[PDB]
Design a protein around this ligand. Structure first.
Ligand SMILES: CCCCCCCCCCCCCCCCCC(=O)OC[C@H](COP(=O)([O-])OC[C@H](O)COP(=O)([O-])OC[C@H](COC(=O)CCCCCCCCCCCCCCCCC)OC(=O)CCCCCCCCCCCCCCCCC)OC(=O)CCCCCCCCCCCCCCCCC
Lengths: 63, 171
């Protein structure tokens, strides 16, 4: 292979792997912030549905 | 937390209906007919406010309208009603079915002297509409601001950047 070919191919390899490394560091920081704050789409552990609640007029009024 | 706010003892004083339960059960159908409107205003206020302290005045109207129901029985048909609630009062379960002749005499004397129709089988269990001027309670549960929900997902789903990015897997 030419030195040009190996050189520019190495630059392509370094671009891809540096972008993957920066995205892995971003992924770790996003996971840490979402577990800490609970405001992202991940770590949304289930709570009770409010569609299960009956809002009909019950038997006794104080409710 | 805060002080609970109760009405005073003078706020709760009203002329009670000092009759027994058989006197009430004997006059129950004509009470549900004639004393419809303040009773339904009260029970509407009672299920809408969900707080008895905001329902006292309407409740006093109930205690105003029941007594005038009984005085109008006492002025006209005191003795057939007295025999009828006595016969109701004899029984343990207070059966209407054991006292049909005194019921017929009471209903006849009431329909002649006062013009009240006894409600039929099915009428007093109806759900009726009530015309009030009090406002609808905007927050009867005394609730507060619900928390802001998490933001939804939006945008077109692009492929994963450089695949899985799991240590060396390039897809
Ligand atoms: C017009 C329309 C139609 C046109 C059609 C045109 C094409 C026609 C052919 C289509 C069919 C596909 C043919 C193969 C395509 C190329 C695949 C390839 O070589 O990938 C290179 C792949 C990555 O190399 P690369 O330099 O980065 O990229 C070159 C390609 O562009 C890589 O490209 P990529 O980036 O897309 O690759 C994706 C990713 C790229 O790879 C990675 O991201 C790296 C990680 C890969 C997995 C590493 C796991 C390590 C731990 C486990 C090791 C197990 C033991 C090792 C093997 C022992 C023997 C069994 O690969 C994977 O995720 C798949 C896993 C590897 C399987 C490869 C396909 C094998 C098919 C035949 C199976 C035969 C047995 C294979 C060996 C069994 C184990 C795999 O090389 C390796 O991972 C090393 C192993 C060699 C690969 C398999 C060789 C295939 C040919 C075998 C013939 C001889 C068989 C003898 C008998 C069986 C063995 C006893």
């Amino acid at each position: 292979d030419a030195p040009e070919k190996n050189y520019e191919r190495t630059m392509a390899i370094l671009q891809i792997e540096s972008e993957k490394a920066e995205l892995r560091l971003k992924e770790l920081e996003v996971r840490r912030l979402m577990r800490a704050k609970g405001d992202g789409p991940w770590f949304q552990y289930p709570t009770i549905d409010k569609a299960l609640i009956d809002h009909s007029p019950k038997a006794t009024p104080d409710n | 937390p805060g002080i609970v706010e109760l009405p005073s003892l003078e706020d709760l004083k009203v002329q009670e209906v000092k009759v027994s339960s058989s006197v009430l059960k004997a006059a129950a159908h004509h009470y549900g007919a004639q004393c419809d409107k303040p009773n339904k205003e009260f029970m509407l206020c009672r299920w809408e406010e969900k707080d008895p302290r905001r329902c006292l005045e309407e409740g006093k109207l109930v205690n105003q309208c029941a007594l005038e129901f009984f005085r109008q029985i006492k002025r006209h048909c005191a003795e057939p009603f007295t025999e009828y609630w006595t016969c109701i009062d004899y029984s343990g379960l207070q059966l209407f079915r054991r006292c049909r002749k005194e019921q017929a005499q009471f209903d006849k004397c009431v329909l002649d002297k006062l013009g009240w129709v006894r409600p039929d089988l099915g009428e007093l269990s109806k759900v009726t509409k009530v015309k009030t001027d009090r406002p609808l309670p905007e927050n009867p549960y005394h609730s507060r601001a619900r928390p802001e929900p998490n933001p939804e997902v939006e945008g077109d789903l692009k492929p994963a950047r450089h695949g899985s990015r799991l240590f060396f897997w390039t897809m």
